Amino acid sequence: IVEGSDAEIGMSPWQVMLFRKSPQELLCGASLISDRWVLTAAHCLLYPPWDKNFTENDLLVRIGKHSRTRYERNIEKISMLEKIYIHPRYNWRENLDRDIALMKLKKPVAFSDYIHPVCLPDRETAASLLQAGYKGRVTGWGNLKETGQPSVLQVVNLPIVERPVCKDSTRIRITDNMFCAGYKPDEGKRGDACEGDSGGPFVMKSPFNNRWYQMGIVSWGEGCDRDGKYGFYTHVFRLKKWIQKVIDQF
């Protein structure tokens, strides 16, 4: 996270760290949506252009963390993956359309003060909160600047941006399955996710029932915190049918 601030303890109990077995390293962010399911971006697991193709046995999921590098004894829980599900129509060749994946934990994780799931939006919540100008929150242990690493989980709040503005900022073709967010060059405020943060959650707090909902998944960007550029996020509600399908069927 670029231009963010240290998160408070227990501030994002659904935050998950995607951790590589060997070499031990941070790969991406992710989120806990139930006691046995973790939501992340497909590009975190599969992206041939960068020779990336991880399987269940290649990584670990670490939940309830605050410190990026420390093994938080008696606080964090590390889990192994049983299965990984990537959207059948994830478009890695062109624009990362439908950049979404689900991971099934080997065994359910017990909730605690530091581990708790986030809600998935319903059509009404998405319709009411996914509007330009409305702010969401992004969290992660990613880089602090495009070109170092934070000591603890970082947080930044960013406004959703008008679709036309998103479209006119890049040459990449954007779809209905994405939305962009970030401040405009004239707003006098900065902030963005960066390397290591992708796959993480973009959340909003409903003013109707006081619950936190994951509206997006950090998906792609060109650089980090560049003026006139914006972060792109997978539209979670738009892909909820697939999510429920996988969970219900598997």
């Binding site: 077995k21 060997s22 031990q24 390293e25 941070l26 670990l60 590098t69 420390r70 093994y71 590390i78 192994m80 690493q149």
Partner: peptide, 12 residues
């Protein structure tokens, strides 16, 4: 810096 050692139980 680098990451701290995690229990071996999680690496098998």
């Amino acid at each position: 810096g680098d990451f701290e050692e995690i229990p071996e139980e999680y690496l098998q």
